[PDB]
């Protein structure tokens, strides 16, 4: 009975957002879920952090994924849904999907629909990089890193709506990011107004940039804490949320891993090229800066790296998709 209520107080934007993480409001919520599914509930059951969607990690127990109506939840909950479809023999390190539902019926109101997957081993790469000094054993997770991506990239694209090989899910959202990001950075105030006059003219044109790619499975949010490792054992044991997948160009894929994942370290980056035979190209820091314009997200948002006082475009690239000095 409690759920008509709670449910009911997330009726705009500003209202989910102070209520997605909140985990006493979303506790026996994610108990009457997992009780509803048929599974064992876990003495602990807490919400781990800042989700775009509303998360709850069982100590032992599951992971239970919600999804609202208005922070993208359906369009997410679609792509994550073809995405663990897509996954289901990958040989890549994901979680298994315990079990789907819904909170509620779903006429007049939101039906709240949940997945349920198993937890992944292992410390998120956010966590194991920021607690080591010994950069040797991070190069060589880096390397390990690099082929896991590229056998992540081939995952065959045998979905429906986005993970198709002829989806144009992803240079529409190219063109419209292409449109929107010079006023973009204008708002953000990350680099100098003069760059930012010169990007419009320095950008390329999406179809330009997609020119003759083969597309990839693309895991569009590779932060640093949707993965997961072990760095004394030099293994990536997980890869997680979906929400955010693509039949896009592989390139994209390294805009959030470099920049929030790698915090802009050159050599990391390198370190994941090598392990993927990723071969680097004349253009290859321009069209990885164009893909860092063209991204969805806000991926500046995580950079130690003060990007302001840049004049030449070029010298932005150079400097953070170059090579190691
Ligand atoms: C086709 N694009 C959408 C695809 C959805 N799967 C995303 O969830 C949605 O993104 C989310 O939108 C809501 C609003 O509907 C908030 O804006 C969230 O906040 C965002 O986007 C988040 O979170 C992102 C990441 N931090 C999410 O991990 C970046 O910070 C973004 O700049 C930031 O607006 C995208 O826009």
């Given at each position: 009975?409690?759920?008509?209520?709670?449910?009911?107080?997330?009726?705009?934007?500003?209202?989910?957002?102070?209520?997605?993480?909140?985990?006493?409001?979303?506790?026996?919520?994610?108990?009457?879920?997992?009780?509803?599914?048929?599974?064992?509930?876990?003495?602990?059951?807490?919400?781990?952090?800042?989700?775009?969607?509303?998360?709850?990690?069982?100590?032992?127990?599951?992971?239970?994924?919600?999804?609202?109506?208005?922070?993208?939840?359906?369009?997410?909950?679609?792509?994550?849904?073809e995405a663990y479809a897509v996954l289901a023999?990958?040989?890549?390190?994901?979680?298994?999907?315990?079990?789907?539902?819904?909170?509620?019926?779903?006429?007049?109101?939101?039906?709240?629909?949940?997945?349920?997957?198993?937890?992944?081993?292992?410390?998120?790469?956010?966590?194991?990089?920021?607690?080591?000094?010994?950069?040797?054993?991070?190069?060589?997770?880096?390397?390990?890193?690099?082929?896991?991506?590229?056998?992540?990239?081939?995952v065959p694209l045998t979905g429906?709506?986005?993970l198709?090989?002829?989806?144009?899910?992803?240079?529409?959202?190219?063109?419209?990011?292409?449109?929107?990001?010079?006023?973009?950075?204008?708002?953000?105030?990350?680099?100098?107004?003069?760059?930012?006059?010169?990007?419009?003219?320095?950008?390329?044109?999406?179809?330009?940039?997609?020119?003759?790619?083969?597309?990839?499975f693309?895991?569009?949010?590779?932060?640093?804490?949707?993965?997961?490792?072990?760095?004394?054992?030099?293994?990536?044991?997980?890869?997680?949320?979906?929400?955010?997948?693509?039949?896009?160009?592989?390139?994209?894929?390294?805009?959030?891993?470099?920049?929030?994942?790698?915090?802009?370290?050159?050599?990391?980056?390198?370190?994941?090229?090598?392990?993927?035979?990723?071969?680097?190209?004349?253009?290859?820091?321009?069209?990885?800066?164009?893909?860092?314009?063209?991204?969805?997200?806000?991926?500046?948002?995580?950079?130690?790296?003060?990007?302001?006082?840049?004049?030449?475009?070029?010298?932005?690239?150079?400097?953070?998709?170059?090579?190691?000095?």
């Amino acid at each position: 009975q409690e759920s008509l209520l709670l449910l009911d107080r997330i009726d705009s934007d500003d209202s989910y957002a102070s209520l997605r993480n909140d985990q006493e409001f979303w506790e026996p919520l994610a108990r009457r879920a997992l009780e509803e599914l048929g599974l064992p509930v876990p003495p602990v059951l807490r919400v781990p952090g800042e989700s775009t969607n509303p998360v709850l990690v069982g100590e032992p127990g599951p992971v239970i994924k919600l999804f609202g109506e208005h922070w993208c939840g359906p369009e997410s909950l679609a792509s994550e849904s073809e995405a663990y479809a897509v996954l289901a023999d990958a040989p890549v390190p994901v979680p298994r999907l315990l079990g789907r539902g819904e909170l509620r019926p779903g006429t007049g109101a939101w039906p709240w629909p949940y997945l349920v997957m198993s937890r992944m081993t292992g410390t998120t790469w956010r966590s194991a990089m920021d607690g080591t000094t010994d950069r040797n054993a991070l190069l060589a997770l880096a390397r390990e890193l690099g082929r896991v991506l590229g056998r992540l990239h081939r995952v065959p694209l045998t979905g429906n709506t986005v993970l198709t090989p002829h989806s144009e899910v992803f240079p529409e959202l190219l063109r419209e990011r292409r449109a929107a990001t010079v006023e973009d950075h204008r708002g953000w105030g990350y680099l100098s107004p003069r760059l930012l006059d010169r990007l419009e003219d320095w950008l390329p044109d999406v179809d330009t940039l997609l020119a003759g790619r083969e597309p990839r499975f693309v895991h569009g949010d590779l932060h640093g804490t949707n993965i997961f490792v072990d760095l004394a054992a030099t293994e990536v044991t997980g890869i997680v949320d979906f929400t955010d997948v693509y039949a896009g160009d592989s390139r994209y894929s390294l805009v959030q891993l470099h920049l929030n994942a790698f915090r802009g370290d050159r050599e990391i980056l390198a370190a994941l090229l090598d392990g993927a035979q990723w071969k680097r190209t004349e253009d290859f820091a321009r069209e990885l800066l164009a893909f860092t314009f063209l991204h969805d997200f806000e991926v500046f948002e995580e950079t130690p790296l003060d990007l302001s006082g840049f004049t030449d475009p070029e010298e932005l690239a150079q400097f953070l998709w170059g090579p190691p000095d």
